[model samples]
Target chain A: SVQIVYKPVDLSKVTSKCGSLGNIHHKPGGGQVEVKSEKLDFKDRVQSKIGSLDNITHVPGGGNKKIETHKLTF
Target chain B: SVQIVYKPVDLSKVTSKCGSLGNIHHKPGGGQVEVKSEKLDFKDRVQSKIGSLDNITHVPGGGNKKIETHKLTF
Candidate 1:
């Protein structure tokens, strides 16, 4: 899983800005947005765009979401 | 960042089935799909749906994409 976190960016704003990069999730606290991508290249591209935006900070892996482990039975 | 990987599922199919969960990325080999979410709960919900689908196996962190670290300068 390729995960990237950002701060000072509105979740809705980010999605509205770079929704093409991937899905955007709003943190419960409302100060961060998490972008997920299977392609590191895609993630990197979006990160660059967001990082260049004014007043936004990219916090790589700075998210605090608990990692959940599950077993898939097929 | 929250990342989940799935195996034996067509990337297009998975996205078709659960695009609401997040963005779906097809692996280079086309055997897996990576789902990214900032909300673990959303990821869990989608994972449950995919796990119940026929012939699909959820590979928690099963992805092999190299993690790229980048410094975001604003």
Candidate 2:
């Protein structure tokens, strides 16, 4: 099972600003969005692009959630 | 990239009892054996078989290491 977690961001905004990544969703609590995948390599590709965006930095450590964090100032 | 970690077990013994499961290596401290790979499914197949054997329950919450634990009670 592969999942990428990110701080909740404007999905359309990020996609608009940086082009597309993949299907991402929001689940709030501490608040979050995650991209799920069956294939890790494909997930890795998504991870690489999303991880490169401004403000988002990898949460680090290989945990259940492949996570990244950032603040939306734009 | 995918890797599976195990509390150090008899590589030859497990391979013998468990049939073949690809190359595994030992690294000590708490002691461990890890199988590293480029493909997650192939690694996943190995994870399934090894994970099934007695004493090797998965370490929940995916972390840097895809780890399992067990005792050589066999």
Candidate 3:
């Protein structure tokens, strides 16, 4: 079996701004944060960060699709 | 700010098996779970599930790339 390792990037240094998409929180030890939003662009913005994507799940909101969890690795 | 709602999915019905990627935990209220993995296919496998992707982030691993977080909304 092959092993994959993930690196961390500073949220403060993130070139793309995620404030417009939804609430942004930095992990206490400098890892990933939880984001909630209904805009599709929010996904693209996070994907632009340095890392691979996985485990995407969403919850329902007043007839609009909401993103509950998304993580990026550098 | 635009509001994004995240819906929950039944992990038992999930066609994809994430066992190889990392540990899987079902939320107490049938929401999303936390996944940790280093495989690229792991990400694709999870993406196959029903939902929109968002908030992807990664953490350091044993000299390899690892996936820490990924969330999807249906």
Candidate 4:
């Protein structure tokens, strides 16, 4: 079995006039994975940070269909 | 060193209609996890949420393969 982990990531450092994607990590029993992703448009980002856990998946148009969860480790 | 927990759910008065799969939980280590699931079109309800997080290795029709994320937590 495997699991998905979520953390409260600080966005400001990774976002600025420079334009960059934030990084998140997922370490499982066998190994670890890191994901470097573009910031979800400004609006959705707000909901993602404040909304309840359940709301995280429904930030209007925000979902697996649109968000890319890249597995940076194998 | 973290974990995943499931709270027993009531699906009926849980809401005449489920307000989207709504739930939130936190851990003492200063992190949390939550998941929002749809009522699954009355048809896919049973297996939808359980299709597996590691499914075919991804969310079908949905994707980081397609979505976006904006950093807002910092």
| Model 4 error, position A69 (Å) | 34
The per-model lDDT (C-alpha) reads 0.24, 0.24, 0.27, 0.25
DockQ, all models: 0.04, 0.03, 0.03, 0.04
Q: CA shift at B61, candidate 4, in angstroms?
A: 21
Q: Highest lDDT: give the candidate number.
A: 3
* Most accurate candidate by TM-score: 4
Pairs with steric clashes in candidate 2: A62-B63, A62-B64, A63-B62, A64-B62, B55-B70
Compute the DockQ of candidate 1. Answer: 0.04
Q: What is the Cα-based TM-score of model 4?
A: 0.14
How do the residues A34-71 of candidate 3 rate in per-residue lDDT, one tens digit apiece? 33333232222122232122333331111111123355
Give the chain B TM-score achieved by candidate 3: 0.16
**What is the Å distance of residue B65 in model 4 from its true position?**
20
Ranking of predictions according to lDDT: 3, 4, 1, 2
lDDT of 4 by residue, B1-59 (tens): 33443232222211011123222222211222344434322322122121112311221
Model 2 residue B15 CA deviation in Å: 37
For model 2, what is the alpha-carbon lDDT of residue B69?
31
